[PDB]
Amino acid sequence: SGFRKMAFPSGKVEGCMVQVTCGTTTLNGLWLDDVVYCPRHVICTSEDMLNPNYEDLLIRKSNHNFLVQAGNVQLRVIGHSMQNCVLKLKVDTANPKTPKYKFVRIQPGQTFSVLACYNGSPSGVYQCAMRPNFTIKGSFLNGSCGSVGFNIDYDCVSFCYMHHMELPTGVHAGTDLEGNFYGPFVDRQTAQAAGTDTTITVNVLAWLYAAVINGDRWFLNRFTTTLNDFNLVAMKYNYEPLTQDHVDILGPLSAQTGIAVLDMCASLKELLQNGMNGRTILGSALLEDEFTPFDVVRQCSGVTF
Amino acid sequence: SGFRKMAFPSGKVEGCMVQVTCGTTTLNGLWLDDVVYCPRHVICTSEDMLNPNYEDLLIRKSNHNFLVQAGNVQLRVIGHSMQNCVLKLKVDTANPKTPKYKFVRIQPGQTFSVLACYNGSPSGVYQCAMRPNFTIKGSFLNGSCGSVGFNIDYDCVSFCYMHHMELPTGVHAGTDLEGNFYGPFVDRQTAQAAGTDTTITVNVLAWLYAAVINGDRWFLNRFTTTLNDFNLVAMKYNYEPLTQDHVDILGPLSAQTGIAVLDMCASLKELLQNGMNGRTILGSALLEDEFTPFDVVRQCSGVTF
C-alpha cells in the first residue's frame, strides 16, 4: 500500500531528447522517426521575443542553420517547416530509439509526466496536471523549453505537451505537439492573463477514494448531499462543477470502496466548510487535485508498462 | 522557476529490471553485468514467511529452479549465492544495458528515486527520503519486492535501496544492495517496531531556502536565534537536532539568498510555534522534509545527467 505522486518511467522519452541550436539560442527537441520537433522561438534572439514576426525570422534561416545533436551524434537537417508554434526539422536519420507513439491534445484536469531537460539532456521527471485555466505549475529553468509531457499506455507514448514559456506570474505555458497553445497564450514576451483557475473537483474526489483505500477514513461522515447542493458549495469555494459524467468516471472507485459518490461529496462539502482542523490526508494538509480517477486506479492496482 | 518533487530519469534503471520466479513466488530483480540481485524471500512460500530458515530453504533450490526473464529474453542461471538478505544469481549473459553503477549505503535523511516495478516491468518513478527511523513512506503493492532506489550523478547510477517488506503499520523496509537491512528490520512476517521518527531539520531548512528563491517569503521574520535555542524548540517538536555540519551544508544556499542560517532557523522556530495560519509554502500546508540541500541546489541550477 501507500500512495505517491508517481510519474511514468521516462526511458522511452529519454531516447528521443536532442539539443537544437539556431544561432545563439539552444533548447530541447524531440526526435521521432526522421523529424525533430521543437519550439519555434529557437529562431529568436533576446530582443526578438518582445514582438517576433516568426515568418520573417524563419525565412532568414536555411537547413544548415539548425544544429541538432543527439548526445554526441550530429544529425543532418534536410528540411524545415513551421507548424503553428512548433518547428519540424526533417533529418536524414530515423531515430533508432523511436518508441510507439501518438500525439494527443489533452483536456483540462488531465495529468501527465514531464521530463525536464537542459541542453538535450534529461534532469528529472515529475507528474503534474493541466490546470482548468490551461497553465501548468512546473519546474522549468532557463533552457528547459522543448521539454515534453507525456502519458504511457503499455508500450505507447502519448505526447501531449511541449514547454514554451514562463509567464510573469511564474506559471508555465506550452503547446500540443502540433504547436497549438493550450489556453489563450502566445509565444511572445508580454504580459498574458491566465484567467481564474479552479480546483479539479473530480480529481479531489478520486484522491479521497485513494485515502479510504489506504486507511485514512477520519473525513468520512454522517451526511449525504445532492449534486445540486454540492455544486452550490463548489461554486462558493472555486471548485469545478461536478457533472454526471464525473460521477460515472468515479464508478469503479465507488464500487471498490462501497462509498456512494454523493456520500463522498458530503465529506468533501464538510472539509470545504470546516477545513481539516490540523489533520492530514495521505500526508497532505490541503485537498489534492492532481490525481485523476484513472491515476488512482492505476496506482491501487499496480498497472505496468 | 518553480519547485517540484522531482525524480531522476529512470531509463538507465529500466534496462536492468528483470522478473525472478522461484516455484510459486515472483518478484523483481536487478540485472547488472552477469549477476541478478533480488530479495532472498523469493524462495519462500506464504507460510514460510512467518518464520523462515533461509539457509535450509535455499539448500533445497538448484540453479535451474530460478527462472529469470528479461522482457522476453530468458536468462540461464549458472550459480546462486545468498549475501545477507539478497540472492545473487549468476547468469551466463552480461546485461548489454548495464549502466555505470555503484552500490552505496545511504544515511538517514538522504533522498533517492524509486522505480516501482511488478513482474519485472516498470510502472512509475517517485522521489522519497530515508526516514530517521530507516523506514520509507513509499507506494508498494504486492509483487513490488525487488524494486530499487537510486541516485544518478552524470552517467553513474548509485543503487542504494532494494524493497523487501511492508510493515503492519503500512510503512516500508528494505536493504542496501549487499542485502543489509536499513534499520532493525528482518525479512519475516512478524510485528516489528520502527521506533520514533523525527523530522529532518536540515531538509526543512533547505526547502525554506528553495521557497525564498522562488518568491515565497512571507515566513521571513524579525527574529534570530542561537543553535542551542533552536535545538530546544527542535526537541519539543520532534525535529532532529541541528549541528554545525548541517549549517555548513546549507552554506551555498545561505550565500545565494543572503539569509544567514540562524535567521532561517528563527523563521522555522516561529512556524513551529505558531503554525502557518492557513497559508502555504511552495504549494504545501505543512513543513516539507524530503528535499536535501543538494536536491535544492540541483533543481535551482538545472543540473543534468
UniProtKB/Swiss-Prot annotation, chains A, B:
Q: Which residues lie on this side of the membrane: Cytoplasmic?
A: 1-305
Q: Which gene encodes it?
A: rep
Q: Explain what switches its activity on or off, per the activity regulation comment.
A: Inhibited by pyridone-containing alpha-ketoamides compounds 13a and 13b. In turn, alpha-ketoamide 13b (tert-butyl (1-((S)-1-(((S)-4-(benzylamino)-3,4-dioxo-1-((S)-2-oxopyrrolidin-3-yl)butan-2-yl)amino)-3-cyclopropyl-1-oxopropan-2-yl)-2-oxo-1,2-dihydropyridin-3-yl)carbamate) inhibits SARS-CoV-2 replication in human lung cells. Inhibited ex vivo by michael acceptor inhibitor N3. Inhibited ex vivo by compound 11a and 11b.
Please give the name of this protein: 3C-like proteinase nsp5
Q: Identify the domain of life.
A: Viruses
Catalytic residues at: H41 (for 3cl-pro activity), C145 (nucleophile)
Q: Which residues form the Peptidase C30 domain?
A: 1-305
The reaction(s) annotated as catalysed by this protein in its Swiss-Prot or TrEMBL entry are:
TSAVLQ-|-SGFRK-NH2 and SGVTFQ-|-GKFKK the two peptides corresponding to the two self-cleavage sites of the SARS 3C-like proteinase are the two most reactive peptide substrates. The enzyme exhibits a strong preference for substrates containing Gln at P1 position and Leu at P2 position
Q: What is the lineage of its organism?
A: Viruses, Riboviria, Orthornavirae, Pisuviricota, Pisoniviricetes
Q: Where in the cell is it found?
A: Host cytoplasm; Host Golgi apparatus; Host nucleus
- Subunit note: 3CL-PRO exists as monomer and homodimer. Only the homodimer shows catalytic activity. Interacts with host FBXO22; this interaction promotes the proteasomal degradation of nsp5.
